[PDB]
Amino acid sequence: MHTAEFLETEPTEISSVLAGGYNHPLLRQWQSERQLTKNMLIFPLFISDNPDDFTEIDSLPNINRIGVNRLKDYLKPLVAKGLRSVILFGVPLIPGTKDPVGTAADDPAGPVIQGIKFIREYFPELYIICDVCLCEYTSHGHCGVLYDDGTINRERSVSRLAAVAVNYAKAGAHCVAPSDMIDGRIRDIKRGLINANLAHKTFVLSYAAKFSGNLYGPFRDAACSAPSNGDRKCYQLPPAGRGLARRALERDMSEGADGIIVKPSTFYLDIMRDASEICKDLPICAYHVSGEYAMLHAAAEKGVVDLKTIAFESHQGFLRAGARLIITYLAPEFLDWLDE
Amino acid sequence: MHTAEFLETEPTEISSVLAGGYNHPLLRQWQSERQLTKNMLIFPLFISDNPDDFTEIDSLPNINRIGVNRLKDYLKPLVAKGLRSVILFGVPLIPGTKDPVGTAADDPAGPVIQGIKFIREYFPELYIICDVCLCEYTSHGHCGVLYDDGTINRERSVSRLAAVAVNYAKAGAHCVAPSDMIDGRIRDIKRGLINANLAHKTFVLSYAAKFSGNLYGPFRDAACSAPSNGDRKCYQLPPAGRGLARRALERDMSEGADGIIVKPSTFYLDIMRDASEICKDLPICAYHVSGEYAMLHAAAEKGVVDLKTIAFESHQGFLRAGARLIITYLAPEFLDWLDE
Amino acid sequence: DDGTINRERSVSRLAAVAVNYAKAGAHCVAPSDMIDGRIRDIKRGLINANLAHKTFVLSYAAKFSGNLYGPFRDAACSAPSNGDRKCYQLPPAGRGLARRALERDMSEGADGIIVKPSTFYLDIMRDASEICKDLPICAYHVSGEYAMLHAAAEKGVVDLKTIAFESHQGFLRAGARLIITYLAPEFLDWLDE
Amino acid sequence: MHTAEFLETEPTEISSVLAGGYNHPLLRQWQSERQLTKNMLIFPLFISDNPDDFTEIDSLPNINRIGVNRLKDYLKPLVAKGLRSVILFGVPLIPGTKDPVGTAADDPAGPVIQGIKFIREYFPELYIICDVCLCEYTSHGHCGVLYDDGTINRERSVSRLAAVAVNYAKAGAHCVAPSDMIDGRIRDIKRGLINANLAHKTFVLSYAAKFSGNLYGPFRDAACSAPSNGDRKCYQLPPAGRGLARRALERDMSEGADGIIVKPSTFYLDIMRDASEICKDLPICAYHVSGEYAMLHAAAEKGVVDLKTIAFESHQGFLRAGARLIITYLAPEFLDWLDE
Ligand SMILES: *C(CO)CCC(=O)O
Ligand SMILES: *C(CO)CCC(=O)O
Ligand SMILES: *C(CO)CCC(=O)O
Ligand SMILES: *C(CO)CCC(=O)O
Ligand SMILES: [Zn+2]
Ligand SMILES: [Zn+2]
């Protein structure tokens, strides 16, 4: 008859015993290199050129396109809940606004600058971060000024991007986040800020590690940034490009970045780990993109996982990988959860 | 009139130029530290104690519970497609089979050992990996022998696990993968193998970094391993426990592991990166758990992402993070995709 | 018989005490003896008592001899009898010894370590953060440091809440992620604002 | 009856035995990476524009504001005791002396330059260090030239600071210690020195790691440097800013610093440890600020600790953390103590 067999074991080696460090709920916290707090969250904002706007984004569950006239009633509760920072994204819908050089990018009458002025007056305690790019302002939809052939023109592009970033800062933005990925843009942006005498008050949060992938979905709807002819795989790092990512991190830091952003996040946790060593002295921010965010909601709906649970697992994964800041659409939720 | 502003730029710094390394499709490959190949895939197999079995797992799309009599027709096409390895999971459904010491675990008449003998004869070229645990064979459902209170009994547990692993090897398994997570089990398993004169032919692939989370869903259905009273957070590493994970990796390696497994995968990519340094001389395997696998399918169904695309992004993320082996339910698909 | 500690009997006794505390229901034991090799014996005792998997071992790996243990001598009534405690307690300048003790205790089974004093030994916390990078590090704001802040605050040399925050956040900066302090009640209030 | 229990112990492991290295008083010295000597001390001097001055500073016990006419009788005993270096701080009390550009900073008739000339003639063997800043010479009280809004103007500020440092060197100072903390001031000061052909005889001791805190008390009295509107938290490193401190250390070194100062000291011992690695090839100096100094006296008075004892513990803590130089108000005392 088959009976349970027990092998002859040796005395337990102390070096084998790790269980004593995580047998209690409190220990789970002690074991964390970093704990999740409210001031670590950065809520994205999609400002429309229509003051009374407040449309719901398709691919972006619970996220809408707001106009200045609705901001106040939208931010009030969040700020009271502990929100400390926001990242502005402009969405000009007015016809004839876009062009080949993203002129509307720093339009003082545009959504971005209008939102900055609005927030600075009604919420002088909120930290204002502005994404810096021309994708949402170009006729083509790309992140920069294209040559005649279609490929980006670094020189003119960065020249333009630097102006935009400086103008946002001039408008009152505390921080600029260039999501273009164009070679050397950080240096020119830093120089522009220095020349505008704003380098000492403007934090430069560079999207140092921005990979091309299948998770930018929803954002394409909310921001309306559909590339025109060709792939964005010209500037956006290849998913397997770890070496390039490491070099971009070092480059951006050396070019003046005060902090860096890794995007996507969950699917690029190893990259956050790399940035934590290379950019050990700088704050690292994780960007939970629309695609990852929508992916969690989808799986939760199909009962594959619990939203709050998986939301916590993923976010605390960012902190584990080395991030100390998080740009997420789940901010409103966390502002509640972190209370319990 | 608001007009496009262009800042005065300096000459481009060579150190800024990285674009020259990934402007072509072929370059995307050259930029990869490791390329995805067929022999890197490990398909999981859920063997039932019913020879004619072939039930579809709920929470596990396209995955079923097979009986020995259906294996052959199921493996034939996969093997012809390039499959080189499998990881066996036993699913005894016969009543009165489970007990307090997982006696049925190494039952020569059980699904696991029956599957090994079957595969070794019909597919002598397939690499046979066997998960090693007692969760699916205990009355309680836990991964080991519990004390009277309910908490695991390391001594008896590891003593039992070592016997099971050795018996699988004796049956003919090429590799054993202890997924228990009980402190010091690797040492006892290695010693048992050495004493059984099988240490030189048995690869020990330890689940060194196994985290507790919300992604083990589907498996609970396929394997029928529902914990009885309490949480598995007693042995399974806490999601934020990076320090513990690093110590477990070092421990298992020092205890005789020939390779290590990181599970989950995607949500723990930073941990794979850590293992790649600590266990730089050992092969690292990523385990795309049921929850992650189901999460991709769910998101794909909701049109949030494309299955093939995101499947490739996630898998190539494993390789980027340092893994050179992958246990995934998407193996059948990749065996097709890798052809194009 | 001479007066100097007897490691063998001492550690033998300490291990029993720690195990009994655990048997009583304590989640964690913190050996503040500083006697060579006590962590190993305590871990072994716990293993033999089948409590090693539920008992966290928080060792005072870096305990220095100094002029800041004042107040505690009153509260605990632990006045040494003949001689100095400088026999086991690390010398204030002993960085090398502190580093070796940290490594030793970790290798002996410590699940976490305590650095005491704290403020006056911030560099040691920094060392422990590298050596014991995978373990939680705890700072112990001793009675002397605690009383020193109150004294200076009373003399209007500094503001209690302010300096309390500066010192504590100094512990975190130096690498600690846990803090044993008498200012806890206060922080439980302050951290609310 | 409760009786003493003794567990069964194993043979002592040699690796456990460390006691053999510090069982004797002499061993306490052998165990020190660096021993405290007289030539390691740097006594601060507050020179007033009143030659017969000699007022006692409130918040600074045993420290006074001296005029040139009292220096000689004040330094004579200290120098005979072994004093080898001093750090000069100017305290112009004459009305209409301060202005928006700290003009009086390098006034040849000012206290600082007057003190240098005095010391160079009566004590040609003393090493003269001069703090470099404009806080004590500006109408506002800040460490530099402010813009119209109130925030520092780096360009003009550093431009001014470089002139001041060079003029001190021209006057005869052996070393300059810029305590401004303004970005890039070290580079301009080094360049000015090079252009003045004094770079080979002037040691640049930068306050690389100067944190904002609650320990600058007493100095505000002795130096009379009360900020006007706003916080000094604009240039002074945030108490938790380790990353910034590490970057400032590297920056200053690369900019020409021959040595660096960490201030405060005791409360920033971990920072001294960081500097010891980053600036391993440069001498590191600890600054026992007024607040820490007064804190020891206060605690000693309340019988919380013994002055001599705690003075020794704290100072030898600086050496342990990596410093090999110490700027302290307890110098006079140590010049006595180090004799026994
Ligand atoms: C990145 C654009 O800067 C954000 C994409 C998203 O989906 O959040
Ligand atoms: C882990 C059990 O050993 C596998 C879980 C899964 O869902 O694949
Ligand atoms: C250390 C005794 O274990 C504590 C001393 C104190 O004053 O807190
Ligand atoms: C720093 C000014 O440079 C000295 C402050 C003190 O209190 O010593
Ligand atoms: Zn863009
Ligand atoms: Zn199991």
Ligand SMILES: [Zn+2]
């Ligand atoms: Zn100043």
